[PDB]
Amino acid sequence: MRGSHHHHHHGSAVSAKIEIYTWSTCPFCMRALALLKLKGVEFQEYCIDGDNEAREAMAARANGKRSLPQIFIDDQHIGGCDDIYALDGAGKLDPLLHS
């Protein structure tokens, strides 16, 4: 195991689970994607263009909301584009991404 390794009872290596549901061409989705990309974090985008079934799966997790985008971090519903930008402006987004 050659390398410079961090030990703190981590056990199996896991990380933040970051999810965003989008339409690719929605300007609010595009703005939220830009913010996540600028943070440099690894994240999963559920691009659901034209997919009603996926929108209903999204709504089932997002308090019935079908507005876009919808963002989850470690399985918690964060909200939409305005919500993530508001958190960042308050200095509260970085801690949630783990930093």
Author numbering: 1 to 99
List sentences from the manuscript.
In the case of the glutaredoxin that is the focus of this study, glutaredoxin A from the cyanobacterium Synechocystis sp. PCC 6803 serves as the preferred electron donor for the 2-electron reduction of arsenate to arsenite, catalyzed by arsenate reductase. As part of the thioredoxin superfamily, glutaredoxin A shares the characteristic thioredoxin fold. The structure of the wild-type protein is comprised of the major protein secondary structure elements: four α-helical segments, and four mixed parallel: anti-parallel β-strands that form a single β-pleated sheet. Our random mutagenesis approach has yielded four new crystal structures of glutaredoxin A, one for each of the following variants: R27L, A75I, A79S, and P84R.
The overall structure of the R27L variant is virtually indistinguishable from that of the wild-type protein. The RMSD (root-mean-square deviation) between both structures is 0.099 Å over all atoms, and the Leu27 substitution was confirmed in the refined experimental electron density. Arg27 occurs at the C-terminal end of α-helix 1 of the wild-type protein and potentially forms a H-bond with Tyr74. In addition, Arg27 occurs in a cluster of other basic residues (...K-R-K...), so it is likely that it is part of a localized positively charged patch on the surface of the protein. The leucine substitution would obviously disrupt this patch, but little else would be predicted to occur. Crystals of the wild-type protein diffract to 1.7 Å resolution, while the R27L mutation produced crystals that diffract X-rays to 1.2 Å resolution. The sizes of the crystals of the wild-type and R27L variants were similar, so the increase in diffraction cannot be explained by larger crystals. There is a possibility that more efficient hydrophobic packing between symmetry-related molecules, mediated by the leucine replacement, contributed to more efficient crystal packing. This observation is essentially what has been described as surface entropy reduction (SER). The R27L crystal structure lacks two neighbors; the A75I and A79S mutant have no net differences, while the P84R mutant adds three possible interactions.
